[PDB]
From a paper:
The crystal structure of stefin B in space group I4 demonstrates that protein crystals can contain a partial rotational order–disorder structure. The lattice of stefin B crystals is composed of five tetramer layers: four well ordered layers which are followed by an additional layer of alternatively placed tetramers. When the occupancies of alternate positions and overlapping are equal, the crystal lattice indeed fulfills the criteria of space group I422; when these occupancies are not equal, the lattice only fulfills the criteria of space group I4. The crystal lattice is composed of monomers that are packed in tetrameric rings (as also called tetramers) positioned on top of each other along the fourfold crystallographic symmetry axis. In tetramers, the first binding loop, 46-QVVAG-50, packs against the groove that was formed at the side of the next molecule in the ring. The disordered N-termini fill the area in the centre around the fourfold crystal symmetry axis, whereas the residues of the second binding loop (74-PHENKP-79) are positioned on the external surface of the tetramer. Additionally, assembly analysis using PISA indicates that the tetramers are not a biologically relevant assembly. However, one cannot disregard the differences between the occupancies of the same molecules in crystal 1, which were 0.58, 0.42, 0.51 and 0.49 for molecules 0A, 0B, 5A and 5B, respectively. Hence, we can conclude that the observed crystal disorder is not twinning but rotational order–disorder which was produced by random combinations of unit cells with different positions of tetramers 0 and 5 in an otherwise well arranged crystal network.
During our attempts to crystallize various oligomeric forms of the cysteine protease inhibitor human stefin B, which is used as a model protein to study amyloid fibrillation and amyloid-membrane perforation, several data sets were collected. The stefin B molecules share the cystatin fold, which is similar to that determined in the crystal structure of the complex with papain and which is composed of a five-stranded β-sheet that is packed against an α-helix. Here, we describe the structure solution, refinement and crystal packing of monomeric molecules of stefin B, which was identified as a crystal structure with rotational order–disorder packing.
Numbering used by the authors: 8 to 98
Write the structure that this text describes.
Amino acid sequence: ATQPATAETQHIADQVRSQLEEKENKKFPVFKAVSFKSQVVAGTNYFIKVHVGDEDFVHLRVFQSLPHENKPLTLSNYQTNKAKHDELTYF
């Protein structure tokens, strides 16, 4: 289940912000992780709801490799145009 963001969630979000900014061709007035859920695969998928200013939100899908293969966090996919009350659905 989705849980409120911790500092670790903000760190994961921060590591992919530039990938998002590049794909969106803009910068964000704010980038605050608010909640997340995680999913074990071969590695771990993090789904993160992030406030990006004015009651706008983005949902991120971030892939984290297992520690032992030392690869950075990658942005697998994202959804923009989300609201504060929107469920953090898998996608």
